[PDB]
Amino acid sequence: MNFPNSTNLPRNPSMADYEARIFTFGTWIYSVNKEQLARAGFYALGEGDKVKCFHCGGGLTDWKPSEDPWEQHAKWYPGCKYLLEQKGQEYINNIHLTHSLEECLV
Ligand SMILES: Cc1cnn(C[C@H]2C[NH2+][C@H](C)CN2CC(=O)N2CC(C)(C)c3cnc(Cc4ccccc4)cc32)c1
Ligand code: NA
Ligand SMILES: [Zn+2]
């Protein structure tokens, strides 16, 4: 995998628009909602349920129905400027705390 983009400039500007991201999914069979994915910056690659964020370039796969796009975006790509713009560092910290705590109980 490539290093995550942490600048304020998106790595894939062709996918900066919500509607452009939506088109990439086509008929979507997966447990996670495509519009929810698009809203969280993600577009489909067309193999299984692999998605990439247009901004950080961050890739995710194998979506369980309990996995939220924004939460996962924060878990795995915490430097993403798009994430920070949309959700705020307050949200981002609670998510980190929550995940880093879930381990304790597990
Ligand atoms: C394989 C893998 C590792 N962890 N998980 C658990 C899942 C659970 N569902 C969640 C929705 C996401 N999880 C993490 C995940 O998806 N990560 C974590 C990471 C960053 C190490 C990683 C690397 N590379 C892939 C592959 C890839 C996907 C898009 C484009 C190109 C390659 C996935 C992935 C799956
Ligand atoms: Na498809
Ligand atoms: Zn991102």
The helix (H) or strand (E) run that includes residue 35 is helix 34-39
Lookup: tokens for 50: 């692999």
Neighbours of 54 (CB within 10 A): 24
Report the CATH number that the domain containing residue 97 is assigned in CATH. 1.10.1170.10
Q: 64 alpha carbon to ligand 3 midpoint, in Å?
A: 19
The β-bridge relationship of strands 42-44 and 51-53 is antiparallel
- Mutation to probe ligand 1, out of 1, 2, 60, 102 (largest number of atoms < 8 A from CB): 60
| Whole-angstrom distance, CA of residue 18 vs CA of residue 46 | 17
- Tell me: is residue 73 an annotated ligand-binding position: yes
The residue range of the domain holding 5 is 1-106
| Whole-angstrom distance, CA of residue 75 vs CA of residue 28 | 24
| Whole-angstrom distance, CA of residue 87 vs CA of residue 73 | 11
Going from the C-alpha of 66 to that of each of 20, 32, 69, 71, the distances in angstroms are 26, 9, 10, 11
State how many domains the chain has: 1
**Of the ligands numbered here, which is closest to the C-alpha atom of 55?**
3
Closest by Cα among 58, 36, 60, 38 to 47: 60
DSSP assignment letter at 5 = P
Q: 101 alpha carbon to ligand 1 midpoint, in Å?
A: 20
